[PDB]
Design a protein around this ligand. Structure first.
Ligand SMILES: [Mg+2]
Ligand SMILES: [Mg+2]
Length: 367
């Protein structure tokens, strides 16, 4: 009888959560506008979104366009595409990546580190870091990443060339006609905020597998070298890929238990990207900061003085300074969130690393 121990309780409760509805929407409304060959058989979703992780972060997709699109017409096709995107107020193309500036390639030999520090500016930053003697090389590549890997804004593509370090110019056509893939970094509104969609155009018949190995191996190093115990779980997720029970626990820990931590870090990064790439209005910038401040309140036991400063910066001012200050504080906040999640994750990391044969530890862990 419900006269007695009856309670009700319900009661309901935000940020982007995966739903088959969302996937259907990007596949039918967005993909036809951002891919070079839309065609279910010509593209493939990868990464977190292919995994339907509940706290959605990004959509990574590959478009295999060869031979319809090859080096013969890749320039004309990309130009057509950028023009279309620039005409679409609903879709932002932050950056198009293609090519390298080999003057920033590594392969070691101290001569060349000096020979390539010095094409820079705050390059004492480079040297200040030389003071760390290997893994030195890892944080050097970290520093010169955007010099070495060519990122083009739409404007640079359309003008057809851009200026590099030391009054060197690079030409966009030569670049694409002597390359094999292009990375298109888009932002599209899905949540109540912009989400990045990454499209890789493969216009030769190249095996991308080596690129997967190295990105995986890259994430490993990046996580381990900076002792980020949260991210250090990602290799383990791949390692136990075939143990059903461990896979579910790692997936839970990474995607559900601490999913929001990861999502807030991406969202903050997306802010910095939209900013630096010149596509961030104060309306958009403010909406994003709002949702972030909201969701920060749901990280149990999380505290930060940064929250306060972000609060005051919101006050009048010019959009210009508001956006700049926010950006600066969001960097601190990113680190606070990184540290919070990394501390909570240390136990799980060690708990699961200890579960891998000591021989294989070398390949899932860095001393
Ligand atoms: Mg992904
Ligand atoms: Mg991605």
């Amino acid at each position: 009888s419900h006269h007695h121990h009856h309670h009700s309780l319900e009661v309901l409760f935000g940020s982007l959560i995966y739903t088959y509805k969302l996937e259907k929407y990007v596949r039918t409304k967005i993909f036809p506008k951002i891919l070079l060959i839309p065609d279910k058989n010509r593209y493939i979703i990868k990464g977190s979104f292919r995994r339907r992780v509940p706290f959605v972060t990004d959509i990574d997709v590959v478009n295999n366009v060869y031979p319809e699109i090859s080096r013969e017409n890749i320039y004309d096709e990309i130009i057509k595409l950028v023009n279309n995107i620039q005409s679409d107020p609903n879709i932002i193309l932050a950056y198009l990546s293609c090519g390298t500036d080999e003057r920033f390639k590594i392969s070691t030999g101290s001569s060349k580190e000096l020979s390539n520090i010095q094409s820079l500016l705050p390059d004492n930053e480079k040297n200040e870091f030389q003071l760390v003697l290997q893994k030195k090389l890892f944080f050097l590549n970290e520093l010169i990443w955007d010099h070495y890997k060519l990122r083009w804004k739409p404007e640079d593509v359309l003008i057809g060339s851009m200026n590099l370090a030391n009054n060197v110019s690079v030409n966009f056509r030569e670049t694409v006609e002597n390359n094999s893939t292009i990375l298109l970094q888009y932002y599209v509104k899905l949540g109540s905020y912009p989400v990045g969609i990454d499209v890789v155009i493969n216009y030769q018949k190249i095996d991308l597998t080596p690129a997967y190995k190295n990105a995986a191996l890259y994430q490993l190093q990046l996580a381990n070298y900076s002792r980020e115990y949260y991210y250090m779980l990602f290799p383990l997720r791949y390692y136990f890929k075939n143990n059903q029970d461990i896979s579910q626990r790692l997936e839970n820990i990474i995607e559900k238990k601490y999913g929001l931590y990861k999502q807030l870090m991406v969202r903050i990064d997306d802010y910095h990207t939209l900013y630096k790439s010149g596509n961030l209005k104060i309306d958009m910038a403010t909406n994003i900061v709002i949702g972030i401040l909201r969701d920060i309140e749901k990280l149990p036991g999380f505290e930060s003085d940064t929250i306060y400063q972000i609060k005051k910066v919101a006050t009048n001012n010019s959009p210009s300074i508001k956006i700049e200050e926010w950006d600066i504080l969001l960097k601190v906040l990113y680190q606070e969130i990184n540290t919070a999640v990394n501390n909570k994750s240390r136990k799980y990391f060690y708990r699961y690393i200890a579960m891998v044969p000591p021989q294989d530890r070398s390949k899932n862990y860095i001393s």
